[PDB]
């Protein structure tokens, strides 16, 4: 059947924007991010129960996961990760803590967003053990992975354990490469990422194509980020292009292209990050929703979608 996922990341710092986010257009919501403290306990700064209560009242079928780690972790958090998963004898208590967090907060799964250097030697054993805990409790286990790099510390059993993966098909350049002044999330980069993970023997259905609701401003040597919402505030005439001088993002036509491509080549679309959108008429989440509906794909089945599915 014509169906697709629409997986949205929501940062803790975005919680006061949830009344503007159309959760009826998502199938999955990832709350970002929880991280371990010095004691092996998962810390989340924010009223996650209030958020999930509200979200489930908007879309009672949404699948809500806690996302772990994330792109921005402190040296202390990264060291706690390494201490907890790189020594197999430290994993047991941490794993129980993760499972109890999922139960205590009535969540549907866990998303692993350990990135780059935080993908340490214990990653695969951690994933395999956590996978069993969650499978046995009928919960999801997913991961966000880089566009076109296979980390040595992600073995095949771990990679295949995930219910699906979220390809981070963006950040091809950024503030860490301030002289590569160009698009950070081109259509070609997205296609490269999908093809790459298929070459890793991940089936199409288990791929989710990430798209960015932000861009980078290379005007000065210090590169800054701009949300799509901020770009539209600068002018609605910018909604349908990808570049303003040295600012590079994804406008509506390019998001639309990526949705058309995803419909034929992956199991869905992933969004970083929901509260960066332009809420209302120019919304990129709306572009995704409308395009999947026009293609006759079921996503949420709400708010106009999947009428004749």
Residue numbers in the entry: 36 to 344
From the manuscript:
No culturable Bacteroidete has yet conclusively been shown to deconstruct cellulose via the actions of a PUL7, but we recently identified and characterized a chitin utilization locus (ChiUL) from the aerobic soil bacterium Flavobacterium johnsoniae. The F. johnsoniae ChiUL consists of 11 genes: two SusC/D-like pairs for oligosaccharide capture and transport, an inner membrane transporter, a two-component sensor/regulator pair, and four enzymes. Here we present the crystal structures of the FjChiB chitinase and the FjGH20 chitobiase, as well as a small-angle X-ray scattering (SAXS) envelope of the novel FjChiA_M domain.
The remaining GH18 chitinase of the locus, FjChiB (endo-acting), was active on chitin and CHOs, but to a much lesser extent compared to FjChiA. To investigate these features, we pursued structural determination by X-ray crystallography and were able to solve the structure of FjChiB to 1.63 Å resolution. The asymmetric unit contained one protein molecule without contacts indicative of oligomerization. The overall FjChiB structure is similar to other structurally determined GH18 chitinases, having a (β/α)8 TIM-barrel fold and containing a CID between strand 7 and helix 7 of the (β/α)8-barrel (residues 249–286). The catalytic motif (DxxDxDxE) common amongst GH18 family members, which supports a substrate-assisted catalytic mechanism, is conserved in FjChiB (Asp146-Val147-Asp148-Leu149-Glu150). Electron density consistent with a formate molecule, likely from the crystallization solution, was found in the active site positioned by hydrogen bonds with the hydroxyl moiety of Tyr205 and the carboxyl moiety of Glu150. The orientation and position of the formate molecule is similar to that of the acetyl group of a GlcNAc unit bound in the -1 subsite in several GH18 ligand complex structures. Relative to SmChiB, a processive exo-acting enzyme that is amongst the best studied GH18 enzymes, the binding cleft of FjChiB has two distinct differences, described in more detail below, which leads to the cleft being more open and exposed to the bulk solvent. There is significant diversity amongst GH18 chitinase members in the CID region, both in length and sequence, and the CID in FjChiB, while similar in overall structure, is shorter than the one found in SmChiB, leading to a much more open cleft at the + 1 and + 2 sites. Previous work has shown FjChiB to be an endo-acting chitinase and the openness of the active site cleft is consistent with this activity.
